[PDB]
Structure 1
Amino acid sequence: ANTPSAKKRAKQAEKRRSHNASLRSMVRTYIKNVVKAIDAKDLEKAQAAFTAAVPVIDRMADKGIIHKNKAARHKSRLSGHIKALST
């Protein structure tokens, strides 16, 4: 780079990336656990995973890592799958 503000923006960008990656991994981990819980054909563990996953999903949606429509879509679809499994 040439202007020092470009350098500062760059380094703040790698810091922001190294931050955001961990939290994106965390949310993906929680939804993945939930999804493999439903796909394993068990209800109680699916209930527990959903209850333990919604708070982090919504906290992250508010935190600005992901967009809120995405979180709402995830919640609705997973709840629909579990309710379908309930029968």
Structure 2
Amino acid sequence: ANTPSAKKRAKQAEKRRSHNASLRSMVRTYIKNVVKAIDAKDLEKAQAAFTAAVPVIDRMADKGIIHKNKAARHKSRLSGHIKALS
């Protein structure tokens, strides 16, 4: 059978998965709204929308749910097309 050393981490993994599922989805809905902002072509809300997102993309990267250079790309992808709105 299995050991209570592993039965303890049965709870310690899936409960931790549930916290890491939400915080991960709390990232990518902020990026979707600043792609909805570019797809609406309105800079006048797009500037205010991803400056709400950048404190979330790296704050999650700082605590090891995701990696810190996944943030570094998405901070450089969204800015390289908001500049294209000109």
Question: How far did 1:52 drift?
Answer: 0.5
Q: Secondary structure at the match of 1:41?
A: coil
> Helix, strand or coil for the counterpart of 1:85?
coil
Q: Which runs of 4+ in 1 moved over 4 A?
A: none
- The CA deviation string for residues 15-34 of structure 1, in whole angstroms up to 9 with x for no partner, is 11110011011101100111
Cα deviation, residue 2, structure 1: 1.7
TM-score, structure 2 as length reference: 0.95
Aligned-pair CA distance for 1:57: 0.8
User: 1:62, 1:44 → 2: CA distance?
Assistant: 29
SS in 1 for 2:52: helix
Which has the larger share of helix? 1
RMSD of equivalent CA atoms? 0.9
Deviations 1:22-59 (A, max 9, x none): 10111011001111101111001110111100001111
Aligned residues: 86
Alpha-carbon shift at residue 66 of structure 1 (Å): 0.8
Deviation at 1:12, TM superposition (A): 0.3
Structure 1 distance, partners of 2:14, 2:72, is 29
Name 1:34's counterpart in structure 2: 34
Q: Unpaired runs of 5+ in structure 2?
A: none
Tell me, in whole angstroms, the C-alpha distance in 2 between the residues paired with 1:44 and 1:60. 27
Counterparts of 1:60 and 1:85, CA distance in 2: 28
